[PDB]
Design an enzyme around this catalytic site. Structure first.
Site, PDB file in Angstrom:
ATOM      1  N   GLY B  10       0.954  -1.163  -0.108  1.00 16.59           N
ATOM      2  CA  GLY B  10       0.018   0.203  -0.106  1.00 16.59           C
ATOM      3  C   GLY B  10       1.087   1.449   0.002  1.00 16.59           C
ATOM      4  CB  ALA B  12       0.896   3.858   4.601  1.00 16.49           C
ATOM      5  CD  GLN B  15       3.559   8.124   0.065  1.00 14.97           C
ATOM      6  OE1 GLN B  15       3.082   8.526  -1.158  1.00 14.97           O
ATOM      7  NE2 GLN B  15       3.304   8.530   1.066  1.00 14.97           N
ATOM      8  N   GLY B 146      -3.300  -1.856   2.395  1.00 15.74           N
ATOM      9  CA  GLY B 146      -2.628  -1.998   3.493  1.00 15.74           C
ATOM     10  C   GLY B 146      -3.366  -3.070   4.478  1.00 15.74           C
ATOM     11  CB  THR B 179      -7.379   9.096   2.955  1.00 17.14           C
ATOM     12  OG1 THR B 179      -7.032   7.689   3.270  1.00 17.14           O
ATOM     13  CG2 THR B 179      -5.825   9.753   3.083  1.00 17.14           C
ATOM     14  CD  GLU B 254      18.848 -11.744  20.649  1.00 18.12           C
ATOM     15  OE1 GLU B 254      19.422 -11.751  19.489  1.00 18.12           O
ATOM     16  OE2 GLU B 254      19.421 -10.992  21.662  1.00 18.12           O
TER      17      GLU B 254
HETATM   18  N1  LIG Z   1       3.071   7.837   8.329  1.00 16.86           N
HETATM   19  C1  LIG Z   1       2.215   7.639   7.070  1.00 16.86           C
HETATM   20  N2  LIG Z   1       0.769   7.236   6.977  1.00 16.86           N
HETATM   21  C2  LIG Z   1       0.453   7.212   5.614  1.00 16.86           C
HETATM   22  C3  LIG Z   1       1.168   7.372   4.567  1.00 16.86           C
HETATM   23  N3  LIG Z   1       0.462   7.235   3.564  1.00 16.86           N
HETATM   24  C4  LIG Z   1      -1.025   7.063   3.948  1.00 16.86           C
HETATM   25  N4  LIG Z   1      -0.895   6.946   5.427  1.00 16.86           N
HETATM   26  C5  LIG Z   1      -1.935   6.587   6.260  1.00 16.86           C
HETATM   27  O1  LIG Z   1      -2.370   5.256   5.701  1.00 16.86           O
HETATM   28  C6  LIG Z   1      -3.893   5.415   5.769  1.00 16.86           C
HETATM   29  C7  LIG Z   1      -4.404   4.914   4.437  1.00 16.86           C
HETATM   30  O2  LIG Z   1      -4.016   3.944   3.840  1.00 16.86           O
HETATM   31  P1  LIG Z   1      -3.266   3.809   2.268  1.00 16.86           P
HETATM   32  O3  LIG Z   1      -1.774   3.274   2.638  1.00 16.86           O
HETATM   33  O4  LIG Z   1      -2.941   5.204   1.932  1.00 16.86           O
HETATM   34  O5  LIG Z   1      -4.080   3.172   1.561  1.00 16.86           O
HETATM   35  P2  LIG Z   1      -3.612   1.826   0.598  1.00 16.86           P
HETATM   36  O6  LIG Z   1      -2.558   0.814   1.258  1.00 16.86           O
HETATM   37  O7  LIG Z   1      -2.714   2.211  -0.530  1.00 16.86           O
HETATM   38  O8  LIG Z   1      -4.902   1.126   0.071  1.00 16.86           O
HETATM   39  P3  LIG Z   1      -5.887   1.735  -0.924  1.00 16.86           P
HETATM   40  O9  LIG Z   1      -7.258   1.848  -0.257  1.00 16.86           O
HETATM   41  O10 LIG Z   1      -6.057   0.421  -1.888  1.00 16.86           O
HETATM   42  O11 LIG Z   1      -5.430   2.821  -1.649  1.00 16.86           O
HETATM   43  C8  LIG Z   1      -4.490   6.700   6.218  1.00 16.86           C
HETATM   44  O12 LIG Z   1      -4.709   6.661   7.508  1.00 16.86           O
HETATM   45  C9  LIG Z   1      -3.055   7.496   5.960  1.00 16.86           C
HETATM   46  O13 LIG Z   1      -2.973   8.459   7.058  1.00 16.86           O
HETATM   47  C10 LIG Z   1       2.397   7.799   4.753  1.00 16.86           C
HETATM   48  O14 LIG Z   1       3.148   7.977   3.787  1.00 16.86           O
HETATM   49  N5  LIG Z   1       3.038   7.730   5.996  1.00 16.86           N
END
Ligand SMILES: Nc1nc2c(ncn2[C@@H]2O[C@H](COP(=O)(O)OP(=O)(O)OP(=O)(O)O)[C@@H](O)[C@H]2O)c(=O)[nH]1
Ligand SMILES: Nc1ncnc2c1ncn2[C@@H]1O[C@H](COP(=O)(O)OP(=O)(O)CP(=O)(O)O)[C@@H](O)[C@H]1O
Ligand SMILES: Nc1nc2c(ncn2[C@@H]2O[C@H](COP(=O)(O)OP(=O)(O)O)[C@@H](O)[C@H]2O)c(=O)[nH]1
Ligand SMILES: [Ca+2]
Ligand SMILES: [Ca+2]
Ligand SMILES: [Ca+2]
Ligand SMILES: [Mg+2]
Ligand SMILES: [Mg+2]
Ligand SMILES: [Mg+2]
EC number: 3.6.5.-
Lengths: 345, 438, 54, 424
Positions: B10, B12, B15, B146, B179, B254
């Site tokens: 995903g 998050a 990135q 995710g 989001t 561990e």
């Molecule tokens: N810390 C952090 N949180 C993130 C980031 N990108 C998204 N989030 C958090 O992740 C949540 C949304 O999940 P995403 O990872 O964006 O969605 P996804 O895993 O791509 O799944 P989809 O619904 O198919 O897009 C939200 O609560 C965001 O605040 C990031 O780059 N850093």
């Protein structure tokens, strides 16, 4: 326009506080399940502290200190005093107490009996009192066998009964002193200048629990002299201070109130590291009820600390206004009746 | 030497993974083109950093990582990013339409059509491993991919790699950067189906990172870039023992041994210090005692909670920089006499300490200032269950009205999985209360 | 306060300090669940097409 | 490459649809001839969502123009941006619909619907990943109402797994063409309840009131009304046309905004609405955005509760101050947001402002107060249907009175469903 919720409908103190907040025109009461609140007048049991301070753009304040039950429970208070170096087992202002679990369930049965036999052999007064937080069930006896058997019939505590209490005259009667203490979000300790003496209306008999228990319910139900000396068996500080000057040639401040302020500071400073919300995502304040006993030698003993105390009828308006002024408006300003007990943070 | 494979799922996960691998290269001195001058064994070697990097005959150090996303936009950043030369296209897996913040869409509908592809790519990296420890899985709780696809992947990994350990880095949903409104649904659904497949999960609440960035870095409105750079520092401190010489937390096994006595309670709380703004020209360098003391301040934790009102089961201190054992013990002795640190009666009251002499690496031009010493504390405290309590409550509010449930049922999920997941969380909350409350 | 298991190396050192002594589903089952959910999607879509056909 | 197929049907749908393409082409730097002449890469970042790319770097809107009369579409082709539309995407008949839902849905539009679906199929086949469809139409006429809902049902049959979005103009006696508009609207609403995922309820009563009361236009015209619609349509699609994290596609918007499948009718709002050079502050945008006078549905939000809210801020402003103001409105009026959907207000910010404005805010609300709109249509429907008035226009096209009775019951069920969650 601040917001607050009420989650304890049986709280007489904060029913008035909620009434005062609405009367200012700058506080709006929400539903008890609305999370977008600035202030929570929370419930006594299982207050959801874990859900506080997680609302963006909202400073949240709650009227209870998480972890303060260690001071406001019978068995917890005994364990806290014995195990805390700040208080120690040699604590001179707390009666010798022991935590006794019922046999149908650490425990201090053998330790209690060891000290009991010393008093029996030493020709000393050996009268103890058994009590617990699950009461309205209190037994006073000079025989340890009755005390232990009574507990077996929840966790109880056995402490020394003060066989030589200070007795008011006329009446030759027992009493206890209730002090209201407010601790704000900065952990300032404010002692309400007004206390109450909940007096027994029956003469003290050292040889029937009516003249031995100062509880208001036990006086208004089982005492035939209720309201004879003072209205509602409640003597306020002005009358009591005058009595001490007339009878004992001393003031309430010197003889009693100095020890009361010392005890309040010692207890609250002891648990400060465990309950402080100085660097926490939410802030806490709490009103406490401290109950003291005074012996014939003008020594103040701590009996119990109440975490959800009520107030005297005459003092509801003044105290509740003081709660808003220093504990609520200090965090949420709008558009002294307390004595500050200074200490080291 | 035993290798570790990183899996980023995903937006998050990808990135954050991009930030972490950038930090790893700076720490290990790996250039963006994959060349590592300090590595004298060209084309091979079983050094500590080889647990995360494979080596080619040309000297390129390739991360042992797989990036998975049901939408191509996020991973396309990696394909054209600064470290594009690190990875080969087999490591980057992209779909075309995402899970739309729907757990059922990510787990059942779209997950079924791509799960075999991801496992095949994972098998390729596993075949390069002489002995595989297991996997580190980066994902969010709230996203559809995710939460949904991760749980399916964890189930399959337990089948194909049953003897391997699996660790998570999970992003707990925070409304300030969230989001979607159904993120409490996705978080609980993915926790229920992953609980028996994860040996140790490090939860990071975006609320805590957001406020740390605002408070300690003077960032008015932190972005994902600000959040991820801080997160990668915590992840780097956690994984530094796997990538450098040492004796504490030397393998994934561990981690469970040192932090997870009870398998279901496998969510250690991470606390990091110091976080110093780089815009400060000169800052007084904090001592060992000061940074260690800051590990017990809730304002520095990755999840906001109060460990004073819980009990500890294990505690690990991970120091990086100019730290000697004498100063650590002096700090710990002082902290015990001032802090409320209660352990469970069936565990020793102690600390496992690890020190790496190399000070933390900061990305040039970033927000974090260089520091002489830093510490990350990993403590398994029952107070982290407050995050579950908040999450479960929001689940209860929406599910009592069946709000948004039709989106999940429309993807083939049964309504009973909601209550089944919630009952598992209810049992999990009960387990925490039994351990840490008298 | 006891310090035990001190291991030292060039890049750092580790130790332990004690302050007080103490007082899976198979691939077949996974595929069944995935196919069961896919079947429910097909049934729901077929009902919609039946509704639209009417 | 998440493409959206746009369809405009009938007089109102094409006139509003044409203005929408005129507005967003200006925002993306597309000239009337389809050539890009912008100065920012943010304009072309998500350009493929609404535009196809042709030979010579030409951007052709992915729009299909449908009518049962050639009149309005001839005006569109002769309009400002008329030449930018694909000539083969003009699908039109000659008989017309006579403001009759039955003609659009059963007799006249049935003869034409297959040729429209051929154009839809051609546009969809070239899509890398089709999000779904957006339809602009009115519910009070015959073509946009009757044939428009016929198209939606047939499109859902051919593309069941795609999102159906509509901009639906609600009739009002204040701005009325025929007395049969309540009949056409009631019949169309049931179709929308079943076959759309998102419907922006644009009420001509609200548009007239905004032009009259707020904009100080004594004699509002359809052009004045469509100016408000163009600004609203641009705002609600900002998250689809520009890079962003919140409600960036149709399905994610639906997941955030629709807690129950039938309750997917949104109240749109826009700010500022100025009758002009003064700078507007972030607090001013938020207050106007949530104000009933800036709502396009003629429903009082204080009469209901917000299930979900989507807010879009456009322009160079303080996102920190935007968060503070958004939290301020929720915290000061939390009684109007349902407590069983936590954090139901989601805010997005876009750097590129609309033409002629430095600051703008667009409101998208799923409020239970929208039942007032459906109650209003239901009362007007029943006033005539109790006497079977004007029914012969419809029974002459094969319809039975039972179909009207079912449509009446369906909308009353929708009203009762909104009342269920307003008291919960
Ligand atoms: N810390 C952090 N949180 C993130 C980031 N990108 C998204 N989030 C958090 O992740 C949540 C949304 O999940 P995403 O990872 O964006 O969605 P996804 O895993 O791509 O799944 P989809 O619904 O198919 O897009 C939200 O609560 C965001 O605040 C990031 O780059 N850093
Ligand atoms: N050690 C002791 N010596 C003498 N009297 C004692 C005593 N312990 C308790 N008492 C008496 O018993 C009364 C009730 O005890 P306790 O204060 O525990 O009851 P409670 O908790 O129901 C009243 P509150 O809530 O107001 O404190 C006291 O007010 C005092 O009169
Ligand atoms: N806002 C707006 N409403 C319109 C416009 N034209 C017609 N309407 C409304 O739409 C209804 C008539 O529908 P119309 O589109 O003309 O019928 P159709 O061409 O057969 O679909 C009436 O309620 C009008 O108030 C327009 O340009 N703008
Ligand atoms: Ca090598
Ligand atoms: Ca396993
Ligand atoms: Ca014909
Ligand atoms: Mg009591
Ligand atoms: Mg995604
Ligand atoms: Mg017309």
């Amino acid at each position: 326009m601040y917001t607050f919720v009420v989650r304890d409908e049986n709280s007489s103190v904060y029913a008035e506080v909620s009434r005062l907040l609405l009367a200012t025109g700058q506080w709006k009461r929400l539903r008890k399940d609305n999370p977008r609140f600035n202030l929570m007048l929370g419930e006594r049991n299982r207050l959801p502290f874990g859900r506080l301070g997680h609302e963006p753009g909202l400073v949240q304040l709650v009227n209870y200190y998480r972890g303060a039950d260690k001071l406001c429970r019978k068995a917890s208070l005994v364990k806290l005093i014995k195990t805390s170096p700040e208080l120690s087992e040699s604590c001179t202002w707390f009666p010798e107490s022991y935590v006794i679990y019922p046999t149908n369930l650490t425990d201090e049965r053998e330790v209690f009996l060891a000290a009991y036999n010393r008093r029996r052999e030493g020709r000393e007064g050996n009268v103890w009192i058994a009590k617990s937080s699950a009461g309205a069930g209190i037994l006073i006896s000079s025989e340890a066998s009755e005390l232990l058997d009574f507990i077996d019939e929840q966790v109880h505590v056995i402490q020394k009964y003060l066989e030589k209490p200070l007795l008011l005259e006329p009446g030759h009667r027992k009493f206890d002193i209730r002090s209201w203490v407010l601790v704000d979000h900065l952990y300032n300790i404010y002692l309400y200048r007004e206390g109450v003496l909940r007096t027994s209306s029956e003469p003290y008999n050292s040889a029937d629990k009516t003249c031995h228990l100062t509880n208001h319910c036990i006086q208004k139900e089982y005492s035939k002299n209720y309201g004879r000396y003072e209205e509602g068996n409640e003597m306020f500080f002005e009358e009591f201070n005058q009595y001490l000057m007339d009878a004992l040639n001393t003031t309430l401040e010197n003889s009693i109130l100095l020890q009361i302020k010392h005890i309040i500071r010692s207890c609250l400073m002891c648990i400060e590291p465990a309950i402080s919300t100085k660097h926490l995502h939410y802030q806490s304040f709490q009103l406490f009820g401290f109950d003291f006993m005074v012996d014939e030698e003008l020594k103040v003993w701590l009996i119990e600390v109440n975490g959800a105390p009520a107030c005297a009828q005459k003092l509801y308006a003044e105290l509740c206004q003081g709660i808003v002024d220093v504990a609520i408006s200090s965090v949420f300003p709008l558009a002294s009746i307390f004595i500050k007990l200074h200490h080291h943070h | 030497m035993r290798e570790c494979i990183s899996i980023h799922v995903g937006q998050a996960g990808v990135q954050i993974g991009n930030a972490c691998w950038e930090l790893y290269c700076l720490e290990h001195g790996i250039q963006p083109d994959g060349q590592m001058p300090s590595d004298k064994t060209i084309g091979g070697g079983d050094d500590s950093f080889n647990t995360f990097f494979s080596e080619t005959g040309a000297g390129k150090h390739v991360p042992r990582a797989v990036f998975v996303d049901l939408e191509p936009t996020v991973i396309d950043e990696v394909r054209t990013g600064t470290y594009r030369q690190l990875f080969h296209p087999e490591q980057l897996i992209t779909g075309k339409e995402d899970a739309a913040n729907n757990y059922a869409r990510g787990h059942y509908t779209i997950g079924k059509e791509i799960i075999d592809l991801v496992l095949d790519r994972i098998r390729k990296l596993a075949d390069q491993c002489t002995g595989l420890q297991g996997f580190l899985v980066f994902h969010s709780f709230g996203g559809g991919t995710g939460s949904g696809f991760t749980s399916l992947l964890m189930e399959r990994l337990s089948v194909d790699y049953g003897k391997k350990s699996k660790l998570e880095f999970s992003i707990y949903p925070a409304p300030q950067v969230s989001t979607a409104v159904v993120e409490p649904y996705n978080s609980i659904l993915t926790t229920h189906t992953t609980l028996e497949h994860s040996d140790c999960a490090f939860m990071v609440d975006n609320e805590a990172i957001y406020d740390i960035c605002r408070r300690n870095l003077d960032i008015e409105r932190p972005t994902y870039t600000n959040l991820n750079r801080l997160i990668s520092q915590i992840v780097s401190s956690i994984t530094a023992s796997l990538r450098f010489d040492g004796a504490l937390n030397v393998d994934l096994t561990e981690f469970q041994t040192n932090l997870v006595p009870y398998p279901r309670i496998h969510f250690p709380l991470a606390t990091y210090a110091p976080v110093i703004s780089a815009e400060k020209a000169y800052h007084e360098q904090l001592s060992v005692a000061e940074i260690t003391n800051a590990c017990f301040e809730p304002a520095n934790q990755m999840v906001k909670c109060d460990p004073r009102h819980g009990k500890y089961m294990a505690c690990c201190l991970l120091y990086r920089g100019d730290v000697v054992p004498k100063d650590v013990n002096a700090a710990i002795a002082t902290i015990k006499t001032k802090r409320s640190i209660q352990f469970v009666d069936w565990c020793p009251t102690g600390f496992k300490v690890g020190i790496n002499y190399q000070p933390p690496t900061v990305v040039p031009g970033g927000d974090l200032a260089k520091v002489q010493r830093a510490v990350c504390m990993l403590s398994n405290t029952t107070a982290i269950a407050e995050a579950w309590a908040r999450l479960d409550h929001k689940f209860d509010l929406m599910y009592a009205k069946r709000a948004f449930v039709h989106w999940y049922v429309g993807e083939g999920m049964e309504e009973g999985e909601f209550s089944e997941a919630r009952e598992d969380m209810a049992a999990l909350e009960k387990d925490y209360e039994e351990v840490g409350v008298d | 306060m006891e310090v035990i298991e001190l291991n030292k190396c060039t890049s750092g050192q580790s130790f332990e300090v004690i302050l007080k002594p103490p007082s899976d589903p198979s691939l077949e089952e996974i595929q069944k669940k995935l196919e069961a959910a896919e079947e429910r999607r097909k049934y729901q879509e077929a009902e919609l097409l039946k509704h639209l056909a009417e | 490459m998440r493409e959206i197929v746009h369809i405009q049907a009938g007089q109102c749908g094409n006139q509003i649809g044409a203005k929408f393409w005129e507005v967003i082409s200006d925002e993306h730097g597309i000239d009337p001839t389809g050539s890009y002449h912008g100065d920012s890469d943010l304009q072309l970042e998500r350009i493929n969502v609404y535009y196809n790319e042709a030979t010579g770097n030409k951007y052709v809107p992915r729009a299909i123009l449908v009518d049962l009369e050639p009149g309005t579409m001839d005006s569109v082709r002769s309009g400002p941006f008329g030449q930018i539309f694909r000539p083969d995407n003009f699908v039109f008949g000659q008989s017309g619909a006579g403001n009759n839902w039955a003609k659009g849905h059963y007799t006249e539009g049935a003869e034409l619907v297959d040729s429209v679906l051929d154009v839809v199929r051609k546009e969809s086949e070239s899509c890398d990943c089709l999000q779904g469809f957006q339809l602009t139409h009115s519910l009070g006429g015959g073509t946009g109402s009757g044939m428009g809902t016929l198209l939606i049902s047939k499109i859902r049959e051919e593309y069941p797994d795609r999102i159906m979005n509509t901009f639906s103009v609600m009739p009002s006696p204040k701005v009325s063409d025929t007395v049969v508009e309540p009949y056409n609207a009631t019949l169309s609403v049931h179709q929308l309840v079943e076959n759309t995922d998102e419907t922006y309820c644009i009420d001509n009563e609200a548009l007239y009131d905004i032009c009259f009361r707020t904009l100080k236009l004594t004699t509002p015209t359809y052009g004045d009304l469509n100016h408000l619609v163009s600004a609203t349509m641009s705002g609600v699609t900002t998250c689809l046309r520009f890079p962003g994290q919140l409600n960036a596609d149709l399905r994610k918007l639906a997941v955030n905004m629709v807690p129950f499948p039938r309750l997917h009718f949104f109240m749109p709002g826009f700010a500022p609405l100025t009758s002009q050079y003064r700078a507007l502050t972030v607090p001013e945008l938020t207050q106007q955005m949530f104000d009933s006078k800036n709502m396009m549905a003629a429903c009082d939000p204080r009469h209901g509760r917000y299930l979900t809210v989507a807010a879009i801020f456009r322009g160079r402003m303080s996102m920190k101050e935007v968060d503070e103001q958004m939290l301020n409105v929720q915290n000061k009026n939390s009684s109007y947001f349902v407590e069983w959907i936590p954090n139901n207000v989601k805010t997005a910010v876009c750097d590129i402002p609309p033409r002629g404005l430095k600051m703008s805010a667009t409101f998208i609300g799923n409020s239970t107060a929208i039942q007032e709109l459906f109650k209003r249509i239901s009362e007007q429907f029943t006033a005539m249907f109790r006497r079977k008035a004007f029914l012969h226009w419809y029974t002459g096209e094969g319809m039975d009175e039972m179909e009207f009775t079912e449509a009446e019951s369906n909308m009353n069920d929708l009203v009762s469903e909104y009342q269920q969650y307003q008291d919960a």
